[PDB]
Amino acid sequence: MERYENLFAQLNDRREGAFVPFVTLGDPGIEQSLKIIDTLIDAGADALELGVPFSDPLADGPTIQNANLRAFAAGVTPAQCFEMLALIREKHPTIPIGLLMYANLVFNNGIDAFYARCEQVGVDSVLVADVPVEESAPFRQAALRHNIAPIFICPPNADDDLLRQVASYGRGYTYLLALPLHHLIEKLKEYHAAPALQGFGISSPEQVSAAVRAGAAGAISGSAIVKIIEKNLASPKQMLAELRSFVSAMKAASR
Amino acid sequence: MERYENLFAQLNDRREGAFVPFVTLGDPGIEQSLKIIDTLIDAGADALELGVPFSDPLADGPTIQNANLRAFAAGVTPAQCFEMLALIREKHPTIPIGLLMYANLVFNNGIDAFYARCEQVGVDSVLVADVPVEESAPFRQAALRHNIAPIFICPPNADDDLLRQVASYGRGYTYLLALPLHHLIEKLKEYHAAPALQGFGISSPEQVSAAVRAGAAGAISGSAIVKIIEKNLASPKQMLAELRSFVSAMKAASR
Amino acid sequence: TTLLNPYFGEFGGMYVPQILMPALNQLEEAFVSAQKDPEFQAQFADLLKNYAGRPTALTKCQNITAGTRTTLYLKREDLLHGGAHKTNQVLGQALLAKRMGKSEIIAETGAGQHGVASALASALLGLKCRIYMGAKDVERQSPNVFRMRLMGAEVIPVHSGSATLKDACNEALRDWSGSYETAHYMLGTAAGPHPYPTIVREFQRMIGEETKAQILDKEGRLPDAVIACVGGGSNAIGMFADFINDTSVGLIGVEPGGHGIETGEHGAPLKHGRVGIYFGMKAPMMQTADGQIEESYSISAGLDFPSVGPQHAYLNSIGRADYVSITDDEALEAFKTLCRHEGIIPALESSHALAHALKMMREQPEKEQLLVVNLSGRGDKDIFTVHDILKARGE
Amino acid sequence: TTLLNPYFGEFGGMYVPQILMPALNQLEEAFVSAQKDPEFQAQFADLLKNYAGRPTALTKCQNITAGTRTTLYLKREDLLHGGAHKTNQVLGQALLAKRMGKSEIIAETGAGQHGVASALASALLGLKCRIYMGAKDVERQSPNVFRMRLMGAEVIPVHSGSATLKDACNEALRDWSGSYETAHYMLGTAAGPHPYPTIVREFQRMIGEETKAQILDKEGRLPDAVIACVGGGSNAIGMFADFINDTSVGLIGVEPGGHGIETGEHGAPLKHGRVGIYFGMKAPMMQTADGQIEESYSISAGLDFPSVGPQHAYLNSIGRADYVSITDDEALEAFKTLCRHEGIIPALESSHALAHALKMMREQPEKEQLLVVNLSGRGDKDIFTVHDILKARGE
Ligand code: NA
Ligand code: NA
């Protein structure tokens, strides 16, 4: 978490929103994925959301399931994912790194051991996509014991009791997915929630400026990035230039 | 019938059994069948049993169903059968001619009309293979109104009440198909049955002599004849010479 | 002499070779004795209830009749073990065979369904089952051949010439004529020589008896009409029998119209054939002008029988029951309608009965009427046939 | 907060994305309300009795057990409309969907049998049914696709990557997460997130309740053991549930052993897998060493599920129920044995339960024991599979 607190403090001083891209680790392959991630950071990403390839995903779907398939086709293990994470952190000491996980990969070798490994490689937060707040206690406890921020989704069908739980249990940032964003943000501010990142359908600069204007702390963009990766599988170099151009555009919109 | 009475009277004067071949009318074709029948008579047949091709036979089976099929393949209608019968009678005025029928062909155009046509062409007897004595009354009555002898089968599972009915209702001859033949013949003589012709498995001269020795009036041979027809379908002339040799042998055994 | 009347009016009788009369007389006496035996009835009921699954449901089909004044119930013989009504009477005939001390069963089949029924009854009751089948029917229905063999029956393909049901029947009877002391001939419909039309009716009559009790419980009155498909007549006479003396209840039998009566390709001898003597009985049949038995036709193999049971011919003649026909296409539409609107896949045989009920409702939709259709079988066996047709016509 | 306990010991729970919690909470409340509603129970009973054909028979199989001191009964869920137990709970879930004012049903299927069940229930009750199916399962079972379409369901082939049951499940849940106000997700076994393991058990528990009444009537005592196959767990928990507090009654669940546990090609996660979190639940599963879900294998498609319902994992852990496995070849031999000796063609799923009962009898033939096997389905669907195997091995 500390990295998130420091990031949001600096952005607030700059009157700035965060722009946070998502990619799957090892898509389309390890070295290229490391290249992608360094390109995202150099283009202006304020934080990263990184997916660990899973045998059977769900809160994602299409553009991302292919990314998962590509990473499996390259033979990427969770252990190789943790090695990439350590290297990313060794290159980039301050950027917040969040993981998007599914519960079985956290549970598989022991929950406390998973978050211990996150802390060892320098991850800052973990969102377990199929652990609702109702089931989250052992995950949250292990996360906090290893200085990892537990991330929760605030969905469109949220209600007031969910808002209070997400505000009370989340750290680092709140994943915002009906009330107008403004009112949802108001209630999240009233309940002292972690700074909200809007994460639904963020694909153009005007959506980034809109989220910050609504009172969110920034925006998370997932499918859009992985689509650029999808489009240029045969052109590694065009892939990176397109990724640079998109992220630079999205980050500019947050200022 | 009268022809049967005259035949058996003459054979009894000669201390002789009857030999009676069976063939299907129009097998393998009309002219050949007429040739077959004239060959059977010249070789020494004392009477004839003639089958009318039927769509769906039963008290016969294999060797004969093929004969029926052959006759159908030649396109033989019951009306063509009656024309052949009239001609056979025109060539052969004294030989008893018996038909083997199935009930639907007798019923089809009216039972009385069927036996009227039998009398017109000079048939002497009719065995309806699927009309048991229990159902026979309208058939027997129509037969007798047209001077046709109704033939009944005395089967191996016969009992005393069946013996008395067959003896009382049959005319011309009794079709004999367990009691030793001798005792069955004794009871049939005691009940004044029409002279018995043994008709089960008659295929060699010693069976003809055996039947007459048992007290039967003669023997009927069916499958054996149609087998000779079957064997020589490609040799019309060999067919007739083999038929002549078999019938001459079988008739000799009856003297 | 017989114990029971072999005729229904002019129809019926025992038109078999003399050698088979002792077998038929033995069967009649055993049947008459069995009907008087409380222990036989208790064993039969035990098998029907605890093995075959009787009583079967009487299902109200409200979706089908929406917007009309017809109320339609389906008698669910499709829910019987084996998937058709045929199971009722084979269990009775198999018990009757054991009553006569017999340890073997002879049967023959065309569509294969009667053969499956005879094989399952023989397996349950410990009887050696041999089944004659026209080899063409063999090839046309190799699933049911495997089912019969799975169930331990010996299946015997009959080559004859026409290699069909009539050819299998003839071989089965020839077998029976020499083995009846130890083997029973399990005839598959309410036709043939006496006593079979009577025995099959009595071993199917629980269909109508249950229906009567169920409809009185649910509606407080008897049906305006009960409706059943007629191939040889067993499921229909089983439905009709308990209602014959309830003269307010219409009895409607449905023969297959095939491609249409006017095409000559149908299986409707009762209304469009001519009385003849065949299959051991005097009954309406399909036959040529000079008396050769004609082939029938129906999309449904179970209804492809060129004659009909003599009791139906009799009920028609005196006007107690009415007989109609339904074409392939009408039966197919009824099949689709029941699948879609009630979630029940019916046999194409039974779909002929349903189709006529749908016509009674649709032609006069403000007529109040309470109808029961005998759903004689399930239609899983027909989905490939229905598929090939709809595929071949652009659906 | 929930109204009911989502856990059975450590197993179960609601491990779904946050967006699906309102749908699960709504379903739980509707279910709890329905269980307290005499009118809901009366409607459910009406459908079970008059449409599906309950109660089902309890059949004594004396031929099977000859020469032993085992008495064996079969609970005949094969006689239910549709031919398997799956029909009980889809009728309940479809009524529950209407209780929440829903007019659409979402389902997914692999073997196709649950899809056929959901389609027939949706047709009867007037619900729009859309069914997700892994396209490979599509190709493998095109009969059931036609059945579902015949019955008016929309079948949606899922291409994903692995195009299988898990891929159809994921698409069905993604659909549900955006449509739950108008659509109900009809899960097909006693697994998944709470409240489904509980709902499916309660809508299947008439199997064991009837069995208890029938065996007390016929034998005057409870079984020594009831035995059922376990794919996801619904037919087994339906049999077990009413006996759980009868501690003298053994509860035996049978997982598929496939080619043998030691080959790794099996579907026995309860005894040979490892606890994980997947399908919305914490439960035993087949998974790789670093936590990717493994594929299961069984000759029987209905048992090819790499996890198991959490209540079974709980009953095993406390020793109230025992779980065993049966290989393809053992199930095939039991299938053949029932066909030959009782005239009943069983589902290959249910044949795993029968095979274990045959082993209990054959290994200790002078042990007196009263056994009930849940015959969860009929096996007409499997005759082609059984044929190809016996043909390929020289039979
Ligand atoms: Na007919
Ligand atoms: Na399983």
From Swiss-Prot, chains A, B:
Any one Pfam family match given in the protein's UniProt record, by short name: Trp_syntA
Catalytic site: 49, 60
GO biological process, one term: L-tryptophan biosynthetic process
GO cellular component annotations of the record: cytosol
Keywords: Allosteric enzyme, Amino-acid biosynthesis, Aromatic amino acid biosynthesis, Lyase, Tryptophan biosynthesis
SUPFAM superfamilies: Ribulose-phoshate binding barrel
Protein's job: The alpha subunit is responsible for the aldol cleavage of indoleglycerol phosphate to indole and glyceraldehyde 3-phosphate.
Protein name according to UniProt: Tryptophan synthase alpha chain
Organism: Salmonella typhimurium (strain LT2 / SGSC1412 / ATCC 700720)
Gene: trpA
Swiss-Prot record, chains C, D:
Named cofactor requirement(s): pyridoxal 5'-phosphate
PROSITE patterns the UniProt entry points to: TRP_SYNTHASE_BETA
Single GO MF descriptor: identical protein binding
Pfam families noted in UniProt: PALP
InterPro entries: Trp_synth_b_CS (IPR006653), Trp_synth_beta (IPR006654), Trp_synth_beta/beta-like (IPR023026), TrpB-like_PALP (IPR001926), TrpB-like_PALP_sf (IPR036052)
Enzyme Commission number: 4.2.1.20
Pathway: Amino-acid biosynthesis; L-tryptophan biosynthesis; L-tryptophan from chorismate: step 5/5
Lyase listed as a keyword: yes
Keywords attached to this entry: Amino-acid biosynthesis, Aromatic amino acid biosynthesis, Lyase, Pyridoxal phosphate, Tryptophan biosynthesis
GO biological process: L-tryptophan biosynthetic process
Catalysed transformations (reactions): (1S,2R)-1-C-(indol-3-yl)glycerol 3-phosphate + L-serine = D-glyceraldehyde 3-phosphate + L-tryptophan + H2O
Reported function: The beta subunit is responsible for the synthesis of L-tryptophan from indole and L-serine.
Name of protein: Tryptophan synthase beta chain
Organism expressing this protein natively: Salmonella typhimurium (strain LT2 / SGSC1412 / ATCC 700720)
Gene name of the encoded protein: trpB
